[PDB]
Design a protein around this ligand. Sequence first.
Ligand SMILES: [Mg+2]
Ligand SMILES: [Mg+2]
Ligand SMILES: [Mg+2]
Ligand SMILES: [Mg+2]
Lengths: 59, 175, 104, 119
Amino acid sequence: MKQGIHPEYHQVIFLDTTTNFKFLSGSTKTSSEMMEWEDGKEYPVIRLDISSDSHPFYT
Amino acid sequence: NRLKEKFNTEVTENLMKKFNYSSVMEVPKIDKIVVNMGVGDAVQNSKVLDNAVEELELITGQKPLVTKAKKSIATFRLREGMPIGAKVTLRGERMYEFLDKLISVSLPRVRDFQGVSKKAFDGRGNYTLGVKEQLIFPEIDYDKVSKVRGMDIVIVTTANTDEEARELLANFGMP
Amino acid sequence: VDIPREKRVVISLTYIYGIGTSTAQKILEEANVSADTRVKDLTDDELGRIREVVDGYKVEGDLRRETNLNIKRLMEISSYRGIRHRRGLPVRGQKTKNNARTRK
Amino acid sequence: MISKIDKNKVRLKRHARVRTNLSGTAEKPRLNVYRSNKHIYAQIIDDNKGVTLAQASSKDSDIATTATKVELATKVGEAIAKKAADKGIKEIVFDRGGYLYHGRVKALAEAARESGLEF
RNA sequence: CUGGGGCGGUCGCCUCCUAAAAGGUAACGGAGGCGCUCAAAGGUUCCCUCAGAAUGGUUGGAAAUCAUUCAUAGAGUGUAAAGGCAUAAGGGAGCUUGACUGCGAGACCUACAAGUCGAGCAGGGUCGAAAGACGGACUUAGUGAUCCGGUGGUUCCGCAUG
RNA sequence: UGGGCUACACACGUGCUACAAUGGACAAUACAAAGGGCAGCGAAACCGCGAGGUCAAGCAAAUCCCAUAAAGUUGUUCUCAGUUCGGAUUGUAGUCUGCAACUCGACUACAUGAAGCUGGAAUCGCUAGUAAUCGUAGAUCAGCAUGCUACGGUGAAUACGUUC
Ligand SMILES: [Mg+2]
Ligand SMILES: [Mg+2]
Ligand SMILES: [Mg+2]
Ligand SMILES: [Mg+2]
């Protein structure tokens, strides 16, 4: 909770075109363009990933 | 703290029907995630530690604790002091924000088939996953980081034996 | 991006990563620039029209990101084209006797 | 697994350490503190005989509200002094238990200083 | 000094053992240390508890670091050893200077000189909400008389007086 | 058939290209000689940024083709920096030859641009169309030379003297 030592984080809406598994965070303090209301109303700057599009295990 | 309800679903939908617990309190519960990076012997890496304390803040947004040495072991150059570690204990909702992020981006970027293990436990309910730093900074790409590295993520739960900690790790985990 | 002033633009865009003598033709195609544009060029309304054509290119630094991982992919498969990177080997099938110095 | 400690046992160790140079002798008695999670308990003990002189509590019917849990501790510190104004209103020794001098243990002691007790 | 003397060695303090369940007790008996160090390694108020063992975990030396469970102290305690100690005397943090002045009833030790411990009393502080705690370091070594000389104070003397 | 003769922390020979503004980059515009061409040389057209592909035009050749030599000259340029000096080395074109270019070829295409500012002691070549430079041919050869062998273009300086 301490002020001064923390970096930034926010509700990073992981905008992936396959089902948009938006439960992530980090330091993507970039352009906020489209925020889904069911998801984190913040920057969608996670633009593309292989997170939950095709798992190697549950293929 | 959105997908915390994934746990609140699985406490009564799967775990009450698997082991048949007699009360909702004694379901196995995750308490802390420590992301202890490791040693990285700093005869020179005390400047790379300033990078290593900068990389781990980007993974989890809390400042690491630079853990120092304890003994004066020879065939190793270190004394009391000589900061040769870093860790962040992730207690609250930052755990689940890190957990429901990492278990979707750990197996894909590692390019492994199975990916972690079938067993890594210690007979008590603690996992200790091992990372060679192929996953982190998923937002800003490989632009300004310098040296390849290797993390270590430990999952400490209130599980009692191995098979109850397999049940919590069977919620979007890949054993 | 980070080009220098006080020189001609046919040699000025060369100073960044990813352009050598394509600014004479390819950047000259899209933008209506000339050859004698010094620091006194007023290339601010022309900064936008070169920004549209440089956005299609991989040039400014980001090509070296893909160039680095192409070697990293090549050594991970452990090919003969890739072992020569990790081992000072000239890689493209050269004679590794006396006059092979620039790879050491 | 991980074993969660109870906060009473650690408190007891701390209190034991505290209460080795801290004693009441009936010319200067000792009030100690037991806050649990809801209620604050105060009690004047003379440590020589092992005999108390007074007792107050946040769950007693004279002072039982749902005020703040801090203003409840202020009511108990008002209560233990006006019962120690019946006998032995002299100096006492504040015993914090194993708790910090902060919040509810402090408001129990701030209230007793401004209600006749001279510690 | 000396199991003649010489040669060698030794000479002052500290710690054990010899020491015979108080103290004390010799040998050219058996073991070792000291001729300092620290402005925090002192003061005080707060928190805190170790080594080791398994176990399993990007560094992987066996053994750095991380987590769990056992751990009575096996750790640590400026420095030899012996007594101590988790009241922590060990480990952190915050404030600070009591690493004060004048004393001291009483006691230990002892041939003398010396040496040691002190409640308490003022004075004036520091820390703490307070009670209180503070006249140096966990304790026990880290030194050397008198005479002479230097230096700074000093309501003292200073030769007939100043 | 598959490797190897092509390996390398290195050490000497022999050459190539350079370390530039008596140059570099782009436009124009000249002038040769020698030799080859038995399905080989393959024009002029096209289609490709280019390496080059598709057929016929000619011919077993003083005529047809390789083949527009290049340096030069003329003009515009950069301004004296490891800069428009050069281009080594690495990924992108898959061009062509050939059962097949990974060991292990040949170019060009956009990238990347490293050593290198004329070299110490020493040492070598050379007396006129010669040193120096510039490009063109052929033999080998399916493909492949910075080598070799022949070819022309431009072309200095210097020899008082025999004592070392
Ligand atoms: Mg004798
Ligand atoms: Mg005795
Ligand atoms: Mg010890
Ligand atoms: Mg202490």
